[PDB]
C-alpha cells in the first residue's frame, strides 16, 4: 500500500533520518526497542504502521530507511546511541575515505566503488515492499557526499525506476551566512543534476531558521537539534494523510502532480506553522484564518525571499489537526480579496484541502508545544529566482580567476562542466523570468 | 534506453485513445439499432393498421 | 421487478451514497445488522427497488463502489453501516488518481475496468427487467470525473434503453480543491453532453451559504452537505419509491423536463431549510412552501436564476395536503412573474404530490428545474480554461500521459457552440 | 550590470503594468 | 528402505564424516553413549533413525560409514575424541604410509595394498542392510589420500555394482588461494576418473566459504569447524524427505535422476541458504521469496562463478522447514519472469518441489541460529565451466617444462596419461561449450 523509503545521505541526511524516525515512533508510541512492552498500561499504537515500519511474525517492527555515509565517524556516533537496537547494522554503511564538501572525489574517485552494495540494498528494501510512490532522499547541497553520491545515486535510481515519484530534500546555502568557502562549487553541479534528472526539490535554509526562533522561540544559543524537529515536523505534515486517513485524504502523487506545473519549475516554497514555544502557545487564541495569515508573511519562510517581488502561479494547502471546513473557506474568502498577495492573471484559484484528523503530538523534552491543529504549505512564485541569481553571480566572480579549480582539475573533471552548469542555469533563470511576466 | 521507453509508453497510450475511439463508434452504432428498432416497429403498425 | 442499480464513484461520491444508504435503512427501518425492524406497511412492497431478496430477510445493498484509493474503503467500512454492503463490489486499485482525468482514465481504466463491468453485468442480468442507473460521483478528482464518464459510456453502450441520471458536483472559482479542475471539467463536460441522458448541478459553496445564513450551524462539515444531498435524491425517488396519487419516475422527468437532449443539466433544490430555534415556530403551509421553493435564497445554486428565463420547472411534493393550491399558486406566480419564465411555452411548472410523507418530517417538497442560470459558470469555465491553455500551463503531465493536446481544442470548440446555443436560447423572442 | 539594470527597468515596467492592473481591478469592484 | 552407506577418505573426508554424524546424533537426540539413557526427561528420539543408524537387540545404535585414512594420526586424532563409544575401531583403518597431496603412489604403491580389507568391510556393511539407495563418498581432490585411493576405490565400486547410484562430494581447489601446490596433478586425474566412471559429482571451494563467512555471519577469525558444518547443514539439507517425510517426498533417485541431463554433464551448482549468524537471524523477517531470490545472487554461490555468463537447463528445488506452498508458486512465478536470470531458448521450466515438516535444528556452541524453514538448490549451467578453463591452462603452463613430474616417473605410472587427461578435459569443455550454445 503508500509505502515509501527514505534515502539519508552525509551527515545532515543522517541526522534528519533519525530524527523522522524518531518522531515516527514517538507519535506512534513505537518503543526503542522494536516490541510493544507495554502490557500493563497501554497508550496507542493500534493505527496503520505499516507506511513506514514493517511488521515481522514477531512483532517486530522494521525501519525502512538508507543510512549511508562515507566518514565513518557518523556512523560510529549513530551506533553508539540509545537507538542502535532499532534498525540492523547492514543498513548503515560505513567507508574509509570520505568527500567532506567535494564533488570531485566524492563524484569519481569516491562515489563508484560503493555502488553496487547500495543498489542492493535498495533493491531488497523496494522487494520487501508492496506498493510504492515515492522516495525521500535527504541529503545536502554543502556536503561533498551528500552531492556526488547523492547526483550519482539518484542518476541510477531514476532510470531503473521512472515510474515513481523522485522527491528532494536538501540544504541550500544562505548568502549571509555559510559553513564552507566550496559550497557554491558543489552546489552549481548538484543543481543541473536535480533540476534536469528529478521531478521536484525542495530547499532551505538555516538563517531563517535562526531568525524565526530567535523570534518566536526566543532562544539566544540555538543547536542543530530545533533545526533537525522542525524538518521532522514538516516532513511528518507534508506526508501526514499517508500513516492516517481524513475527510480528504491527501497523498504523495495527488499534491506532486499539481505541484509541478512545468518541468523546469519544481521549487516550492514551503512553510511550516505554528512555529512557537511553549509560552506562545498557553494565552494565543489560535484558529485557521490567522496562521494561514502568517504563512504568506515573508518573515515566517524559511528562505529569504520577498514574496511581493514576484506572484503566485501554484499553491498547494495542507492541514493537520481538528480543522474545521468553515475556517478554511473563510481563510480562502479572505486571502482571494487580499491585494497585498500577488499573483498571475491567469490563475485566479488553485490549493488543496487536507483535512487530517489526529492532532500534531509532542515529544518530552522538545520546545513545540501541544497545538490544536498544525499548518503547512507549499506555493510556488518566481521571487525565489533571486537566490539562484546570487549563486551565479558568486559562481561567476569566483571562476573568473579560476579559485580552488586546480584541485578539481587535478582529480579529475573536464572544466566545460563548469560553464555548462552556468549556461544551464542562466537558462532556468530566464524561463522563470518569462514565466514570471504576465501579458 | 529510457528513450525507447517512452516511445513504447506513447504506443500503448495511442493505442488507448484507438480503443475510446472503437467505444465512441460502437454507441454510435447502438443509436442507430435503436432507430431502426423503431422503423421496423412502426412498419409492424402499419400493417396491423391496413 | 423495476429495480434501480446503484453505482459509485470518487471519494465525495463514495462518502455522499454511503450517507444516502445510511439514510435510506433509516427512514425504512432497516438495522445496522442487516434484517428489517421498520414497522411501516409500504416499506415491505416496494422494498426490493435497491435491495435484493435473500434468506431469512436479511436484503442487501446494490450499489458498486468504484475507486483507485484503498484507503476510502476502510474509511466507509469503519462506519455504524459499512458492515452491511457488498465486500465484492468493492473493486479498487493500488495507484492512485493523482487528480488527473487523462492518467486515470487511461492507465487506471483498462486493467480495472473489467472487474466492474463484470459485476454490474452479473448484477443487471440477476434481475428481470431494470429501467436505469445512478451514479453519484465528484468532477473534482481522477476517481470520480475519470472513470464515472467511461463506465456510463460503457453502461450506455451495453444497455442503450436505460436511464442515465448522475449528481456529478461542478467547480467553483472561489471554493476550488484543484490547480487543474478546469481541465478536468473541461474533459468530462464533452461526455456529459455526448452520451449522458441527464445531469444534475451540485455546489458545495451554495450549500455552505445556506447552512450557515438558515440553518445557522456552529461547525458545519461535509457530513451536513451529504444529508442535505441525501435528502434531495431521495425526494426525487420517492416517486417511484412510496407511490401516491399522481406518481411519477425518472423518465417522464427526463423526457419533459429537457427540451433538447443538448441541455440536460438542472437545478436541485429542498424546501424545509430552517435553523434549529424555528423548527417549533412554524406554520406548515403551501404559500410558503412556494415561496421558499421559488426564492433563489434557499436553492443550492452558486448563480442566481433571475438572470434568465424559466425553461423547465418541477415541483414534486411529499406529504398530505391537496391538488387546487398547487395549481392556483403556480397560476399566480405564472401571472405576476411574467418576466421569469419563457412566454413561448406556456405552463412550465409541472405538479406532482406523494401522499406517502417521509420519515421523521411530514410536510417534504423537492424543487426540480431547469433555469437559466449554469450560463455563467459555462462562461466563467470556458473563459479560465482559455487562460489556462493560452501558454499551456500544467500540460506537460497529460502530454507525458500520452494523449495529445486536440482534445482540448475539439472540447472548448464544444464549448463554446454549447455556450452559444445556450446564451440565443436565452433570449428565446416570440417572432421577428 | 548593464543588462541587469535593463531587466530592472523591464521589471519596473512590469510593475507598473500589475499597477494598471490593480487598478482595473478595483475599478470593477 | 531408504539406507544409504557414506565413504571418508582422507582428513576432510573423515572430519566432515565426524560432523555429519555428530548433527545426526544432536538432531535426533542420540546420545554419544549409544543408547538411550534418557529415562527421567525425554526430548524426542521417536522416529526413523535407520536411514543411518541401526537398532541392535540391547538398543544400540551403530553408525554405518566407511572412516578409511593412511595417514595414522587422523584415526588417533578421532579416537582420542569424546565420541569414540559411538562407532567401532574396525571401520577406522589405519596404515603405515600415506600419500599426503600426492597421486602416483596413492594409486600404485599404496592404494593396490590396503583393497580386500576396505572391500570386505563394505560387503558386510551392504549385507547388514536391506535396501541401498547410493552412495556418499566424502574426499578431496587436493588430499592424495582423497584422490588415488577414492579414484581406486569407486573403479571398483562402479563395476561392481552398476546399478546403485554413486555420488561425489569433494572440495575444489580455488584459483585464488591454495594450499598445497601440486593439486591440480591430482586434480586434473581425478577428474577423468569421476567423469567417465561416476553419475554425478559436487564441487565446492574454500574461498566462497570465507567470503559468505565474513559477509553474513561477519567473523574475523574463521577456522574448519564452521566450514565443516555448512557441509553438514547441506548433507542434511539434500537427504531430508530419507530420515523423514512431508507433503512431496524427494528420494535420491527422485533428484538424481533429473539432475543429470547428460551423461558428461553433471556437476550442479549447490547453494544453501540462509547461511546467517545468530545476530542475522533475529530483526530479519524471513520469507520463500526473498531466500529463492537471494539463492541465485552469485555472492551466495559456493563457486567463484557469475551465473549471468552463461545459462540454466535444468534446477533442482528442495525446501526444509515450515513452507507455504503459496509461497512457493509466487517465488516460481516471480523468477519464472526475471530478465536477469538466463535460461537456454529450449526449457521453459524445470525444478522439484520438497517439503520437508522437520524444521532445520541448531547446534550449542555453533554459528547456525534457529531458523523456521530452510532451502537448498542445485542448478546445471554452462557459466561454470571457467573453473575447467583455468585449471587446463594451469595445468598446461605447468606441464610444458614438466614440473614435478620426475616423481611420477620414478613412482611408475605412464606419462602419455596427463595427455589423455588433457584432451579428455578439452573434449569435456568443448560438450560444454556445445550445450550452452542456443539456436
Known sequence: ?439 | ?50 | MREIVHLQAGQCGNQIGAKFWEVISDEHGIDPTGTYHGDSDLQLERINVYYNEATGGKYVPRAVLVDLEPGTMDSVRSGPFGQIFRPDNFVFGQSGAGNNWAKGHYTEGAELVDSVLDVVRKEAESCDCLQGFQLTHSLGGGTGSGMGTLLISKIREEYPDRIMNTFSVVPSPKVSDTVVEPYNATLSVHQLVENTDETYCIDNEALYDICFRTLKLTTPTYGDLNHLVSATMSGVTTCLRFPGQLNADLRKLAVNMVPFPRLHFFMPGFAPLTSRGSQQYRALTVPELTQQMFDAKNMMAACDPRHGRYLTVAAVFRGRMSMKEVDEQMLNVQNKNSSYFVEWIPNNVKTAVCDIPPRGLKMSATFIGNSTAIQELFKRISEQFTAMFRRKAFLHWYTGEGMDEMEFTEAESNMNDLVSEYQQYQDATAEE | ?29
Open chain 4, 1 to 29: 550590470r548593464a543588462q541587469e539594470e535593463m531587466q530592472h527597468w523591464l521589471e519596473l515596467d512590469q510593475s507598473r503594468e500589475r499597477r494598471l492592473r490593480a487598478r482595473q481591478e478595483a475599478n470593477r469592484t
Open chain 2, 1 to 50: 534506453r529510457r528513450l525507447q521507453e517512452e516511445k513504447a509508453m506513447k504506443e500503448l497510450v495511442e493505442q488507448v485513445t484507438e480503443a475510446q475511439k472503437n467505444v465512441k463508434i460502437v454507441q454510435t452504432k447502438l443509436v442507430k439499432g435503436r432507430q431502426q428498432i423503431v422503423q421496423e416497429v412502426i412498419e409492424e403498425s402499419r400493417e396491423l393498421l391496413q
Open chain 1, 1 to 439: 500500500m503508500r509505502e515509501c523509503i527514505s534515502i539519508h545521505v552525509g551527515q545532515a541526511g543522517v541526522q534528519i533520518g533519525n530524527a523522522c524516525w524518531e518522531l515516527y515512533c514517538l507519535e506512534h508510541g513505537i518503543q526503542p526497542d522494536g516490541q510493544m512492552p507495554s502490557d500493563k498500561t497501554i497508550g496507542g499504537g493500534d493505527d496503520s504502521f505499516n507506511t513506514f515500519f514493517s511488521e515481522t511474525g514477531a512483532g517486530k517492527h522494521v525501519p525502512r530507511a538508507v543510512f549511508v555515509d562515507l566518514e565513518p565517524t557518523v556512523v560510529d556516533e549513530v551506533r553508539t546511541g540509545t537507538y542502535r537496537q532499532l534498525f540492523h547494522p547492514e543498513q548503515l554503511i560505513t567507508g574509509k575515505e570520505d568527500a567532506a564538501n567535494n564533488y570531485a572525489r566524492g563524484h569519481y574517485t569516491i562515489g563508484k566503488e560503493i555502488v553496487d552494495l547500495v543498489l542492493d540494498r535498495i533493491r531488497k528494501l523496494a522487494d520487501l515492499c508492496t506498493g510504492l510512490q515515492g522516495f525521500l532522499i535527504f541529503h545536502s547541497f554543502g556536503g561533498g557526499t551528500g552531492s556526488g553520491f547523492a547526483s550519482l545515486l539518484m542518476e541510477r535510481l531514476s532510470v531503473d525506476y521512472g515510474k515513481k515519484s523522485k522527491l528532494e530534500f536538501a540544504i541550500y546555502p544562505a548568502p549571509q551566512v555559510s559553513t564552507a568557502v566550496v559550497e557554491p562549487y558543489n552546489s552549481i553541479l548538484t543543481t543541473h543534476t536535480t533540476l534536469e534528472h528529478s521531478d521536484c526539490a525542495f530547499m532551505v535554509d538555516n538563517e531563517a531558521i535562526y531568525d524565526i526562533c530567535r523570534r518566536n522561540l526566543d532562544i539566544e544559543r540555538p543547536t542543530y537539534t530545533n533545526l533537525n524537529r522542525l524538518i521532522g515536523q514538516i516532513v511528518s505534515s507534508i506526508t501526514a494523510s499517508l500513516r492516517f486517513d481524513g475527510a480528504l485524504n491527501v497523498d504523495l502523487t495527488e499534491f506532486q502532480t499539481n505541484l509541478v506545473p512545468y518541468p523546469r519549475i519544481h521549487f516550492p516554497l514551503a512553510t511550516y506553522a505554528p512555529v512557537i514555544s511553549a509560552e506562545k502557545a498557553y494565552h494565543e487564541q489560535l484558529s485557521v484564518a490567522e496562521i494561514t495569515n502568517a504563512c504568506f508573511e515573508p518573515a515566517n519562510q524559511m528562505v529569504k525571499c520577498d514574496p511581493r517581488h514576484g506572484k503566485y502561479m501554484a499553491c498547494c494547502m495542507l492541514y493537520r489537526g481538528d480543522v474545521v471546513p468553515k475556517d478554511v473557506n473563510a481563510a480562502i474568502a479572505t486571502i482571494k480579496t487580499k491585494r497585498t498577495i500577488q499573483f498571475v492573471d491567469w490563475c485566479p484559484t488553485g490549493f488543496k484541502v487536507g483535512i487530517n484528523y489526529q492532532p500534531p503530538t509532542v515529544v518530552p523534552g522538545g520546545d513545540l508545544a501541544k497545538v490544536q491543529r498544525a499548518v503547512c504549505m507549499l506555493s510556488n512564485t518566481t521571487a525565489i529566482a533571486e537566490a539562484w541569481a546570487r549563486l551565479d553571480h558568486k559562481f561567476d566572480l569566483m571562476y573568473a580567476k579560476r579559485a580552488f579549480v586546480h584541485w578539481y582539475v587535478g582529480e579529475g573533471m573536464e572544466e566545460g562542466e563548469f560553464s555548462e552548469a552556468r549556461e544551464d542555469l542562466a537558462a532556468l533563470e530566464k524561463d522563470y523570468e518569462e514565466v514570471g511576466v504576465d501579458s
